[PDB]
Design a protein around this nucleic acid. Structure first.
Lengths: 100, 197, 117
RNA sequence: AAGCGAGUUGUCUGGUAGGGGAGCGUUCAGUCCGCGGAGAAGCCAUACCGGAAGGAGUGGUGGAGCCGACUGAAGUGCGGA
RNA sequence: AGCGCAUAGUACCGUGAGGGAAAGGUGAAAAGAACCCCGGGAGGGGAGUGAAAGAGAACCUGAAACCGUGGACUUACAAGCAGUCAUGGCACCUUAUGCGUGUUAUGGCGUGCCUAUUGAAGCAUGAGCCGGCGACUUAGACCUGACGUGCGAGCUUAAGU
């Protein structure tokens, strides 16, 4: 009825809200593939007991492509000489995701 | 074997070893060309006192930090900067060995380049350049490539000077200056041909 | 030789003037309070999206401290109640979620409260 | 046909005089089939990418050219003296 | 910019030999313009001229500190040169997709850069800004050394054709 949980990191609320995610090594590049493991969060209809028996049944999410990147340059330094710089090569996929 | 026109059709002379390729140790013949033949001049500035003016000055140590004492710095607008590009005469020699083979190396994969044996033109009479150059149609040579030129005549070998078309300077010998310029290397003179001489 | 860069050094100043945000007066096209204020916008700006955790840290230590004291509550000397279930592990974010359903500690009180003996 | 690494472990430290090392681009020059009248080059602004520097999407305006890859050259670049 | 001179080393600085500017540019062509207005006139209207007069009779494009006005928004009861994020707050929605664009009461607190300094964040100094100049290199068998190559018995100056 809502959605929380893990993997990659923690940044949720989304249950259909559509938010950019992280990535994966092999197994990428290709519309949708589906991936799962165990769980942690739930809530549900007044029934989010813990993060222990957060497995039992599985709920098949989606997995998009990799979504461009919020490109920048970066800069830092105080009273002396100017050097350095090293881009954020992040991919940040999207992952549709859908309740189960 | 061997393709040709104007005269006969044959070939077996060679010289010039030439394996697969691995060629191009002749880049110093791409600046020497303009060094044993080049006019240095620049903006001409090296003088530290080109201006030639008075001496002495205001109150070097007074008023508002004068920093005066004549004008010898690249500060005041209207002079020079002291030290820089003096005429120059280009001083390089270029090894005298690599030349009568480095050229052969420019035939590594350039072998595909059109080459043969000939004498100006036979199907013509004297000289008047018209249907003589137009003969260069018996192979699509009037607007498809660049045409290399050499010959041994200086009496009928000067009638094709342009900006983007062909080049022409002849001395009857070889020249790196003109070995890629005109895509199909065609010397042939029956007087100073491929002779290693 | 020659170059004359009396025009190319314009986009330079602007390529960094990107941050012509709402600063002060007219620090958006300044030429003083720009390439300086930019050097001002050149500080912990680098670490202004990570270090911030410390700021929002100043949230769940007022809520998680002792919300519904009508139970027992302690938080600090209670965290040893958290990691006292089968597979606790996880912690915050779930505090951000705790802002929704109040029944996040109904049968999740005395289900760790005296989970000692 | 100029050398390149995921799979992995420690190092990947921050660096002042320094060592090995990559570039953004403008002017000169090579090849100019060229790119521009729907008009590019002069310039004003929009969340793509890039190790940073910067390369990108379009009009605006402007009036006649202009830069490109492989390349070497040049008084190649602090607002700050 | 380049010799100071792309029609001046005008006037001159001046006690004297002796020191000197700054400054260019409208399109091919001026056709640099009759005709009623405020006004003394300068300057401004009509309308042709003008292929194109946001060239414009002190004239290409025309970026900018300072400087000209309004507006969507906030603000005098709130305190620190400045900061970045942070919930809100008015606006917009160049893709209803409770998601953003133009932003601010306020919060953590947090002191600038250059740069000769053991040493600071300083009141240590340099700095109102704009536009450029912005330097260990240029010729020299001056030498040592990385790499690619020439050769293992090796490599060339003077110019004569």
């Amino acid at each position: 009825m809502f959605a929380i949980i893990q993997t990659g990191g923690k940044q949720y609320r989304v249950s259909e809200g559509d938010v950019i995610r992280v990535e994966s090594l092999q197994g990428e590049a290709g519309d949708k593939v589906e991936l799962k493991a165990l769980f942690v969060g739930g809530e549900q209809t007044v029934f989010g007991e813990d993060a222990g028996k957060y497995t039992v049944q599985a709920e098949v999410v989606e997995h998009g492509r990799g979504k461009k990147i919020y490109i920048r340059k970066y800069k830092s330094g105080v009273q002396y000489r100017r050097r350095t710089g090293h881009r954020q090569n992040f991919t940040a996929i999207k992952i549709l995701g859908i309740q189960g | 074997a061997q393709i040709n026109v104007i005269g006969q059709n044959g070939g077996r002379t060679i010289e010039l070893p030439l394996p697969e390729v691995n060629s191009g140790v002749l880049h110093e013949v791409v600046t020497w060309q303009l060094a044993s033949r080049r006019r240095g001049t620049a903006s001409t500035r090296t003088r530290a006192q080109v201006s030639k003016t008075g001496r002495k000055m205001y109150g070097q140590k007074g008023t508002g930090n004068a920093r005066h004492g004549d004008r010898s710095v690249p500060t005041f607008v209207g002079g020079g900067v002291a030290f820089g590009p003096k005429p120059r005469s280009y001083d390089y020699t270029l090894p005298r060995q690599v030349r009568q083979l480095g050229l052969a190396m420019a035939i590594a994969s350039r072998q595909e380049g059109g080459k043969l044996v000939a004498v100006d033109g036979f199907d013509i009479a004297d000289a008047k350049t018209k249907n003589f150059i137009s003969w260069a149609k018996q192979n699509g040579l009037d607007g498809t490539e660049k045409v290399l030129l050499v010959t041994d005549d200086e009496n009928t070998r000067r009638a094709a000077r342009n900006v983007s078309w062909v080049s022409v300077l002849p001395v009857a010998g070889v020249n790196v200056y003109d070995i890629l310029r005109h895509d199909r290397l065609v010397i042939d003179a029956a007087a100073l041909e491929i002779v290693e001489e | 030789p020659r170059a004359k860069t009396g025009i190319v050094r314009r986009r330079r100043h602007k390529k960094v003037l990107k941050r012509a945000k709402g600063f002060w007066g007219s620090r958006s096209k300044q030429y003083r309070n720009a390439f300086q204020t930019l050097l001002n916008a050149a500080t912990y700006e680098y670490r202004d999206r990570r270090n911030k955790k410390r700021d929002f840290r100043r949230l769940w230590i007022q809520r998680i401290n002792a919300g519904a004291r009508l139970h027992g509550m302690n938080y600090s000397t209670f965290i040893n109640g958290l990691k006292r279930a089968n597979i606790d592990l996880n912690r915050k974010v779930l505090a951000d979620i705790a802002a929704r359903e109040p029944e996040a500690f109904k049968a999740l009180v005395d289900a760790s409260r005296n989970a000692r003996q």
